UniProtKB/Swiss-Prot annotation, chains A, B, C, D:
Keywords: Calcium, Cell outer membrane, Leucine-rich repeat, Membrane, Metal-binding, Plasmid, Repeat, Secreted. Its main location: membrane. It is found in: Cell outer membrane; Secreted. This is Outer membrane protein YopM. GO terms for molecular function: metal ion binding. Homotetramer forming a hollow cylinder with an inner diameter of approximately 35 angstroms. It comes from Yersinia pestis.
């Protein structure tokens, strides 16, 4: 097609803008034209309220039409490497362009996804916030898949994905997670109905695990290099040995009656809303301690690195001597006989006896 | 009717309890019987999930059937002095029992009220939270009427009610309030669309005025003995001379660029969310000062009686020396160069630089 | 003393009002005089910012000096039956007037209480919010004692108090509660460090138990006529058989993986923040169901009496058909495939997918 | 220096790690060594709790030592182009390295900054959240300066900064802003004490203006291509003609009695907490309308593009027909005679009558 044909196709599309629907087709056409004229790789029509897209520039490699009202996508060029149409009303996707590297279709109404396993270059799949009941098998090229906030009852096999480093499958109805790929560096699967996590100890690169809001009673042996573990709101009474690489630990809303050990390099500990009666010594690396809403009548010595202390809703008669770099002290609702001396560093303070 | 007839009428009513509707007719019948047997003045069937009431004990003087699913009321005895059926699904009321002194029908679906002006003993009318578009003229005996949260566009004439001491007509669509009765001690008419308040200065007994959330640009001369004035969220830039009897003042969410004067006996001042750049000296009587969300770069000397200081969301570099009985200090979000010394009395503290 | 001596003593006291401390001694003197002149039983000097009280009218039976800055109390008349000086700075109390029936000294700085067991008429002791480390033994006349928010590590023996019907000892450091008196109708001891509750099954009149925020792992057999049980935030996985008299149940923040049974007349159930995976059928009497923040993928049929449904933060794909009298629906943060039909009765709605 | 000297200097520094202070000098040394060995341009020692840094690798171009407890910085290489030491305890900075392009020292305790005007390559200055009372004159190379949350009473001259495109000077005590540079694309100066904004109409590139929380009574003629205007919490009753480029408008907490006009391409309008009695027609481009807490008894037709409608705390009897792509409906606290039909698109709903 000649530019004129595109221009006219686009102007026609523009004229067809549903009156009053605030569709910014003029801007879109302008983007389309510029894209066509510049022979630009990417076309960005974000937040233009487009209820549809006209034919796309012929050699578009990247279609960014996020935040529109697209219920359908125009045919995608075989040159398309990146499709970012998150926040649209897409209920379906045509088979992916052979060169698709990035599939950004989060916040849509996708009921199902087209086959993905044959997408030799599909590295990122973001189908987060859709109505996916199932995910097609994933392409070996998959490095990242966000399929959170869907209605997935199962995830396709993942262990054989050589490059899958990040999985977001939170807010689904996963009862189990498939065995994880050795390459996995991160898995966010909170708010599912995971009875248990798959084996994790053999995941040397898994550094982030979010399995909060699940039905976990125990955690498997953790990834040896786990750095962030969020299992907030589960039924954990204990934690397996914690990788010393763990710097972020959220075991809030579990049923810990205490924390016997904390990783030596933990920066963040959120153990709020457990039944923590006592905290083991805190690692000097600890910067944020949230043990809010527990049954602590006493906090252990606060690490001098502690910047955020949230120990509100506990039975503290006293807050230990505050570290001099403490930025935040939320010890609200504690039978504090007196407020602790507040370091000048404290910027955020909340205390209530 | 004999007790047996009542018992049986009641047992029949009990048996007619919609299955599964959790109606506690058995308890109700038990109450009914006890009432009948004891010849008790009052029958209390609160929160029994009753979708209806059977015939009431013959000489019931007080019917308390609050929190049920009554869509209709059984015929009320001519001996009824008190009708408390708040929180029901009453869409209408039969003409009131001649001796009705208390009409408690708040939280119902009353579309209209039966004539009230001829209720020689109607002292309290609580039709709050209903679907009243209008209130019938009020009985001279009216001492209290709560008709708030209705769809009243007007209130009936009130100035001629010799004993009306309290009017709750907040949350209605009143554009104006009728002239108020000399007897009025309190008027709560916030959340209406009052363009102005009626003359108030000639209301020697009016001690409480709630005209918050209206369309007030100014307040009339206030009741000389006004004690509580809540005109929160209006378009006030100024206040008329404040009665020295004023102990409670809420002028929050108005457009005060400052407060030049405060009643000498003010206990509570909520001037939050105005554009207060400066506060006049605070009366030593002040116990609670809420000037949160203003444009104060400085607070005046805090009265030693001050117990609650909410000056958060201001431009305070410093919080003045805190009074020794200060219980609450919320100065969160102020460019505080430093937190003020916190009196040991402070139980509730919130500071954020 | 002659009135003049009192007047002058009072005027002298008035003149001694610390300048600027907002003490309303003039009003106090006015109250004092009126009390003296009227020979009134009660003297009410509430919220007058009084840092002290002058000699009290000679035959005062009731001293109400709540909300002042009293650090000391003037000698109390032997005729004093009621002492209400809550919200003051009292650190100590002289031995109680022999006729003291009501000891209202909540919100003070009482470090200790004078002997109470010999107060033949002491019926109500409110020493809530003080700095009591211990409570003196209680008088057999004690019907009500609120000693909550203190530093009590133990409560005096209570089982022998024939008329003790209400105990508020929440917010203390009670590890155990003494055996409860047969007369006990209510015990509020939340926010203590109760490892367990004392035997309760032999308390036929105990209808209210608040043992929230403690260290309860189990509850003893409950008072047979228990009506309200709040054991919010404890370590409960199970509940003993629930008295059918139970209408209020708060087992939120415990470790329930489910609720197998609910009292047949339960009006209120707060089981939020547990690990509830399933709810047993709800009693048709249920008006408020709060199972917010659980692991419910499904709610049981909602009782038609249900007025408040808080099932937010769960894994609900669907909210069951809403009862027609539902006033509140908070099902925010649930993977709801769709919002349920909202009954016209719903006044308070919050949904978030 | 030889690597060994650096290694040893670093190991010595490491050994000097204050015991128990959680300083991760080992990791730092590891980073230092790797940096030295790799001859890397950048050294990243973020969040290592370092109370000090040892001598830096000799040809470091970028020092990233954010989130540490640095109170002092080691001598910076003349090769340093980027200094990112935000979130430290730096009270002073030595004269900047001649090649400094990025000065990231936000969240420190800088009382003053070294001369900056002679930093020929200083493009980004981030001294946000410090204790700067004044900013040295800025270098002509300055493209971005964030000096927000300081104690600036004045900003240095800016109009002559040819490349200054972004100024963050919010949360200071600026009474006035210097004339703005033609190059300015964004100015965030909310929470100052700006009596007025400088002339803006001659700023063709100024697309973002945040002057919220100031003392603005009026806005100057706006930058012709202004896209985002946040003047939340000011004393605005009117707005100058709004650039049609305006897509983001926050005039919340001002004193608008209404909005007569809205930019045709406005996506976001936050006019909450004004005294808006009526809204002009909404541009079809409007995606978010927040007129919460106003005095609206009626909302205008909702643009079909509207995704977020926050009209809570108003006097709405009815919510206009909701657009089919509405994602959020917060109309809580409105005397709604009935809830509007909720489009299936609504994911976030809050209604309260
Ligand atoms: Ca045009
Ligand atoms: Ca969704
Ligand atoms: Ca270990
Ligand atoms: Ca707990
Ligand atoms: Ca708790
Ligand atoms: Ca029975
Ligand atoms: Ca209502
Ligand atoms: Ca005056
Ligand atoms: Ca303001
Ligand atoms: Ca503000
Ligand atoms: Ca006087
Ligand atoms: Ca206390
Ligand atoms: Ca049972
Ligand atoms: Ca849970
Ligand atoms: Ca949860
Ligand atoms: Ca090591
Ligand atoms: Ca700061
Ligand atoms: Ca115009
Ligand atoms: Ca307003
Ligand atoms: Ca309002």
């Amino acid at each position: 097609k000649s530019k004129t044909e595109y221009y006219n196709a686009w102007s026609e599309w523009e004229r067809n803008a549903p009156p009053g629907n605030g569709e910014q087709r003029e801007m879109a056409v302008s983007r389309l034209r510029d894209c066509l004229d510049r022979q630009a790789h990417e076309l960005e029509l974000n937040n233009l309220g487009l209820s549809s897209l006209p034919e796309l520039p012929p050699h578009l490699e990247s279609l960014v039409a996020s935040c529109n009202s697209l219920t359908e996508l125009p045919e995608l060029p075989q040159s398309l490497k990146s499709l970012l149409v998150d926040n649209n009303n897409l209920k379906a996707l045509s088979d992916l362009p052979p060169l698709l590297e990035y599939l950004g279709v989060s916040n849509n109404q996708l009921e199902k996804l087209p086959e993905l396993q044959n997408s030799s270059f599909l590295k990122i799949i973001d189908v987060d916030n859709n109505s996916l009941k199932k995910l097609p098998d994933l392409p070996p090229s998959l490095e990242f898949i966000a399929a959170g906030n869907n209605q997935l009852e199962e995830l396709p096999e993942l262990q054989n994905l050589p490059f899958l480093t990040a999985i977001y499958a939170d807010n689904n109805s996963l009862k189990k997670l498939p065995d994880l790929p050795l390459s996995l560096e991160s898995i966010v699967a909170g708010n599912n109905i995971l009875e248990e996590l798959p084996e994790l100890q053999n995941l040397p690169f898994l550094t982030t695990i979010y399995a909060d809001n699940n039905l976990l009673k125990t955690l498997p042996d953790l990834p040896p290099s786990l750095e962030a573990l969020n299992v907030r709101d589960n039924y954990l009474t204990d934690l397996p040995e914690l990788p010393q690489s763990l710097t972020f630990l959220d075991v809030s809303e579990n049923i810990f009656s205490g924390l016997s050990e904390l990783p030596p390099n933990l920066y963040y500990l959120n153990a709020s809303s457990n039944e923590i009666r006592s905290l083991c010594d805190l690692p000097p690396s600890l910067e944020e301690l949230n043990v809010s809403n527990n049954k602590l009548i006493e906090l252990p010595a606060l690490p001098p690195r502690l910047e955020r202390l949230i120990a509100s809703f506990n039975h503290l008669a006293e807050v230990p001597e505050l570290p001099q770099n403490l930025k935040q002290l939320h010890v609200e609702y504690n039978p504090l006989r007196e407020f602790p001396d507040i370091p000048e560093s404290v910027e955020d303070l909340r205390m209530n006896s």
